[PDB]
Structure 1
Amino acid sequence: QYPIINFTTAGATVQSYTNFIRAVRGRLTTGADVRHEIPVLPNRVGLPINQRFILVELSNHAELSVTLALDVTNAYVVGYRAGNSAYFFHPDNQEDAEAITHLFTDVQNRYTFAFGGNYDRLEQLAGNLRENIELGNGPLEEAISALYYYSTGGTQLPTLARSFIICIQMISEAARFQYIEGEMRTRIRYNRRSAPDPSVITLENSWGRLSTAIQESNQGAFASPIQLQRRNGSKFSVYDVSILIPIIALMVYRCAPPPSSQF
């Protein structure tokens, strides 16, 4: 029922990854909500359950497959399926707990992790911060295998957490930010794995705040500036939506758009 987007790390190229991220965005946003040229994800309020999730089927060179489930309201990876088992992060509320019962309904074994799926929790379990976890095609290839083998005992909990961190950034964060997509394209082009620099980290950390600032803006102008970081870690001040158009690809719904107010 839910749309499926396929990607493989096997012989991945800049183009195949670009096609994948574009398709993910296409299934996440409906086209109904575009503000300052930036699409907004569907509002959770009144969103029918048959429109709530998308599925990302990840394959690798090792001939293994896992399916991630993404919530369309925030691009959040809520859980995954590998063969006869499915695993969901501890839901943040009762609504999201009910919603996930509509996922992988034919699977033999259903588990809900006792831990939530946010970076802070996953970093704790991994024993490493995002800034020390390498990203790229190699890490993703390995992440798919680690997720696949979890139910049989082959994957340590820190490895599982690290593997989620890799998947979330290379799929959800890349979907959210053209900038992060670009950073992943670079890694794929040269087949060189590397941890995300401060520009990537601060964008990830600022997605919610940027979404709200843009939506609350006065004709694009922020009431309060947002501080981002450059690749070298130096501060970059954001005063306006204009500078973000090439950077942010989609936003979480935060408030209803104000009337057009033409002159």
Structure 2
Amino acid sequence: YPIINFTTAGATVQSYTNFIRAVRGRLTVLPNCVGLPINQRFILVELSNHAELSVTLALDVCNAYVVGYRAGNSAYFFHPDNQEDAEAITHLFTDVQNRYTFAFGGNYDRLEQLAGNLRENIELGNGPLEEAISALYYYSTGGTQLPTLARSFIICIQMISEAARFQYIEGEM
């Protein structure tokens, strides 16, 4: 799958905008993914911060949304909404040692609920993304609690998936 790199380290409006344009350019926004081969069904987005920590998000080309991610030797996947997606995601991060599928989905309503106690007033920006990348990475070694993970997913989804999605839709008027 195509790999799209972005770092928060020395990030500008231009570097971030080019990043989102790149993602948007790989989308084929369709109400549902079906007539699409699994060899081009996903976009991989490698995120890294100032701490040099790096995670790779798996984005569905049909809707731009995060279906799962990789952090070093571990891969995490949101509960697939159906059998097609259940086996589609098995083609992601195939060389990773540890694989886990959450029982919950990656939709906003679920994530908001899971962040519950914590995340009000979720601030977006380079700073938050930077911290979100670390949260994603440390989840794999027990350093990140579920509510923090949920908040971190929201940050990534709003700054990446939702940004690309919005630009695609304004792109087609």
Q: Structure 1-normalised TM-score?
A: 0.61
Equivalences, count: 173
How far does residue 129 in structure 1 lie from its aligned partner after superposition? 9.1
Which digits, 9 at most, give the CA deviation of each residue in 1:137-179, with x for residues without a partner? Answer: 1000000000000011111110000000000000011001139
Between 21-30 and 173-182, the greater mean CA deviation after superposition: 173-182
Q: CA deviation at 1:105?
A: 0.2
User: Contact (CA 8 Å) 1:175, 1:181: kept in 2 or not?
Assistant: no
Give CA deviations for 1:37-61 in whole Å, capped at 9, x if unaligned.
xxxx496232111111010000100
Change (3 A) 1:107 1:125: same
1:167 & 1:181 partners in 2: Cα distance?
Answer: 20
User: Residues 72 and 51 of structure 1: is their aligned pair in 2 closer, same or farther, counting only changes over 3 Å?
Assistant: same
Q: Please tell me whether the aligned partners of residues 76 and 99 of structure 2 are also in contact (alpha carbons under 8 angstroms).
A: yes
Q: Deviations over 1:47-83 (max 9, x none)?
A: 1111110100001001100000001111110000000
CA distance in 2, matches of 1:173, 1:104: 23
Secondary structure of 2:15 counterpart: helix
Q: CA deviation at 1:124?
A: 0.7
Equivalent residue, structure 2, for 1:6: 5
**Greater relative CO (CA pairs within 8 A, separation 6+):** 2
Write the distance in 2 (CA, Å) between the matches of 1:122 and 1:12: 27
Distance 1:179 1:112, change over 3 A: closer
Distance 1:59 1:183, change over 3 A: farther
Indicate how the Cα distance of structure 1 residues 182 and 11 shifts in structure 2: closer, same or farther if over 3 A, else same.
farther
Question: Per the alignment, in what secondary structure is the counterpart of residue 177 of structure 1?
Answer: helix
Structure with greater Cα Rg: 1
Structure 1 Cα separation of the partners of residues 138 and 172 of structure 2? 28
- 1:94 paired to 2:83: yes
Change (3 A) 1:3 1:121: same
Consecutive unaligned residues of structure 2, counting only runs of 5 or more, are: none
CA distance in 1, matches of 2:170, 2:136: 22
Distance 1:26 1:151 in 2: 31
Task: Give ranges in structure 1 of 5+ residues lacking alignment.
Answer: 31-40, 185-263
Structure-2-length-normalised TM-score: 0.92
Shift of 1:26: 1.1
Task: State the secondary structure of the residue aligned to 1:58.
Answer: strand
Runs of 4+ in structure 1 over 6 Å off: 128-131, 179-184
Deviations 1:83-112 (A, max 9, x none): 000000001111110100000000000000
Which whole-Å CA distance do the structure 2 matches of 1:149 and 1:130 have between them? 18
Is the partner of 2:68 in helix, strand or coil? strand
Q: Is the 8 A contact 1:5 1:24 kept in 2?
A: yes
**Structure 2 counterpart SS, 1:130:** coil
- Structure 1 residue 180: Cα displacement: 11
Tell me, in whole angstroms, the C-alpha distance in 1 between the residues paired with 2:105 and 2:64.
15
CA distance in 2, matches of 1:29, 1:183: 12
Q: Provide the alpha-carbon RMSD of the alignment.
A: 3.2
State the identity %.
98
Structure 2 residue aligned with 1:138: 127
Give 1:128 shift: 6.2
Partner Cα separation in structure 2 for residue 70 and residue 102 of structure 1: 13
Aligned equivalents of 2:166 and 2:13: distance in 1?
16
- In the alignment, is the contact (CA less than 8 A) between 1:130 and 1:165 conserved in 2? no
Asked whether the 8 Å contact 2:24–2:167 carries over to 1, the reply is no
**8 Å Cα contact 1:42-1:72 kept in structure 2:** no
Query: Is the contact made by 2:118 and 2:148 (CA closer than 8 Å) also made in structure 1?
Result: no
